[model samples]
Target chain A: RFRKICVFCGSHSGHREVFSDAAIELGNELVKRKIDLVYGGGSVGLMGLISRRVYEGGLHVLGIIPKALMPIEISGETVGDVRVVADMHERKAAMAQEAEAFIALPGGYGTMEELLEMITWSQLGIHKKTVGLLNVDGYYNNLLALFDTGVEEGFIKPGARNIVVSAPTAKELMEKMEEYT
Target chain B: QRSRFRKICVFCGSHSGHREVFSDAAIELGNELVKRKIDLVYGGGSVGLMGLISRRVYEGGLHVLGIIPKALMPIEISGETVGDVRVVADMHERKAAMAQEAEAFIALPGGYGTMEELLEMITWSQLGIHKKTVGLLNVDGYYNNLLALFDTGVEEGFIKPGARNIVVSAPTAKELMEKMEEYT
Candidate 1:
């Protein structure tokens, strides 16, 4: 149901094959759903994995990256249509603008930071886009626990906590996103 | 040890949270920074933890700079921030200002905004943007889950142990500052 789902993930391949496998599965699912892809514009790491699969599947791929990050985050050839942004803020705005929904794959600080900002924006009414996590093998269980603790501590709202959807697989995650009203 | 840091950035919530521990820790952190003759940089806000710390630091005769986006000005105003504010075009500019001004970073217990800022600082360090030291004031163990996630990242081989070491944590302000002072 979604056109372009922005995937936030790690720049590294991670330790386990499952992480990369999940990224590939998600990319395949996106293609099957007729969804295009928008990402961080890196041809390395999980960003590269997802975008490469989608691009090879004949789906449109748009990578938005900050120019300053080119030397550090990107290497080789970028996938599909690459839009170089001004900075991290521009990159986030550009990605949000380019995609209808947001899904996070297993990632590090960059991934978590980007995903949290999107959720914060949603809580503040800055945007209404659906945000979900492709929670590969319970990778994000602790992070979700933290959110729940925030809600319990009165730092976060119940409704705000509910904004994030999680599933063990991309198909179910996409389905959950579709059911988001 | 004489600290190399002249200014330290503090990231916290726009909301103060329900526990007294959160704001109390903010006050302690502000006081500790003043005692060290360290200036402060942070997200501009006049309410919640932001207001508490900014006011505390400014009243202690220390410089406090708050970098805030113009769009957020209307939303964050509560008339308690007692520091100089630099209005920027967007959140990116605010972050840039904070990074430029800070030699080190500390985070109090907070929600999404606070966590995102802390993670961004860590990411920057990992990317060699700066080798600044970052700390977490884990008041009441609010950040335990986050630390667990970080450890998990390390064990999963996504985050290097060295990168994980970049984010130091403690349960008290005094202890956290001491650890940061010893960091090079």
Candidate 2:
């Protein structure tokens, strides 16, 4: 939808090969569509994969990291425009403000919390934006089930379903983002 | 592989059972998520069976989002060491919030709370709420009679026959979690 935004992924690489493949697919799709990437300044895992691919595709890449992780050696390569933030909240907020959509690939808990909070914010109608999840390798079956139980329980509006997109793989997840625009 | 679950709404007792294996299983479940890099979507409490499981998930480098009814949060709050725990206004809201956050159900051995959640999910499936995976970790036949009761209900026509075959049951977490994709 808008340029100069970020994508949510994890500092640690995903547990499976398909998870990384899915991340690369998103990066390539962004290049084809010319969408900019603002991300956690991690040089490893999905963050590394996406940033490298996007930069190679001739697209602008932005990296943001906290000082705490820099010492742990989690920041991305010295590529892309990088920024250091005060905390997790600030980093995510910075990315959220710039991008029209928040897209996530298969990631760990941080990725899970990031996507959930983003969707929650949207559900609260704080933003008219879209949040998506790439359910590559059937990674999200449990979460998907819980979503239904949420609707059945009426804690969240059934229509909150539209806030996040679920696709089988990265190519599909990115292609599905067009609807978010 | 780790579950894509960020929030897992759990309905379990406040105490761990007499046996060590239940708690051991709970801890392993938590460590497994961390190894796979997933979170725990659960009731944010320190009591009952869920107490050990949610605590394990939180401690193992994973986030545990707790959604306890406002009244219960004050009594059941599992304290710190947990990441992103929140309290809801009521039980329905808590369940609703947990469901929204979780990816699937992994009801460990328990009495009322676990059974309640399992039945709710099964009934939801029978009603066609969502074709979500209804997994029962039938550890060592822990749910053997429950399974029989479900079958009995199916036979007596009190419960729809479709639900009997609908849920995917396994004896271990590794197996059920692996076969989870068929639900979608």
Candidate 3:
């Protein structure tokens, strides 16, 4: 019974077409599941694509963005309800407050940070929500391997490794997330 | 060049790793910072790599400033803390305060917390938020896979090539400090 799912992705469309394709697939899946959407407030790149899809598909959507990043993140023809926050910290807090589950797509540093913060908070007992990765064309393979390395290095606990449930596609990932915990 | 880096900020994990070298490197990094007369700014914690480095730096007669959120205080400061501790409102305040107090940022081998802090700083740099130098103390290629992902971002056209070089890493603390001094 997940009401809203937060999606984290790159502001850019990325190099390959598969990434955007997956973004569209994920958006359509949310519609099929009847779940709303929450995300970083960007009207361009993958952020815009997914949000617009969900919005057009008849669902409530929220885009939490920072004032400083508005110039860069927001562009022509924005979608959904956008909440402007004071800073990056406020932005993450706002998105976390709205979404019950989290999903990360292919992205750069910002996307990576958002996903990591949730996992860190989960490990610290701050939240018990499920976090997932839409592995899309093996986009997250290296990152997944890194987390396993963290466990072997003893920086991360073996049990805490379950914090990220990843799959090659959105449907599979969502199924895994549905069965999580 | 006027030196604006009398103090440096370190982002690391609350947990110490399986290898003793991680602890050993923390001590070495602390000594190098003190020997160079640079103060330390970090997330407040008394366990893991945070404890090892802060304790060594404090004992070596260098100043230490720990910026920790009030909500995370109990988790971070469970044991004896050395130097000054500043409690902020939340994770955002903790990060903003640490960035304000530090002229540079460094990442030691850590888990989720460390990676999150490091990436946020790098993201800020991409947006021209701060011109401060950012570094990674590699320590036996611990960050190789992470760095590869960053590289993949560059190769995949998600990140600009210029932003990729912002994170300079070295195998040891001394090499890292030497390279950091060269950031102009």
Q: Which number leads on lDDT?
A: 3
lDDT tens readout by residue for model 3, A1-181: 6889999986888778988888999999899999999999898889999999999999988999989899899989777899898887788889899888899778888898889989888888788899988987776788888888889999889999988989998899888988866
Per-residue lDDT of model 3, residues B1-184, tens digit only: 2334689899886788998988888888898888888888899888999998899889878899888989888877975878998889877788889998888988999887888889888888877888978888898888998898988888877789888888888989889988888975
Ranking by lDDT: 3, 1, 2
Q: How would you order the candidates by TM-score, starting with the best? A: 3, 1, 2
Give the alpha carbon lDDT tens digit for every residue of A116-135 in model 2.
65676576455777677777
Please give, for residues B1-184, the per-residue lDDT of candidate 1 as tens digits: 2567789899986788887878899999998888888888888888888888888889888898888888888888665556788889776677878888888899888887887789888888987778899898999889899999988888887788888888988999999998888875
**DockQ, every prediction:** 0.75, 0.01, 0.77
Candidate 2 chain A lowest-lDDT run of ten: A147-156
Off by over 4 Å in 1: A76-78
lDDT of 2 by residue, B30-141 (tens): 6656666677777676765567777777777777776676766665665553666677764446655666566677666554345546665654555454556667666556
Residue A137 in candidate 1 has what lDDT? 86
**Alpha carbon deviation, residue A108, candidate 3 (Å):** 0.8
- Ranked by TM-score, the better of candidates 2 and 3 is 3
**Cα shift from native, residue B73, model 1 (Å):** 2.2
Model 1 pairs whose backbones collide? none
DockQ of 3: 0.77
For model 3, name the residue pairs that clash.
Answer: none
- In candidate 1, the second chain superimposes onto the true chain B with a TM-score of 0.96
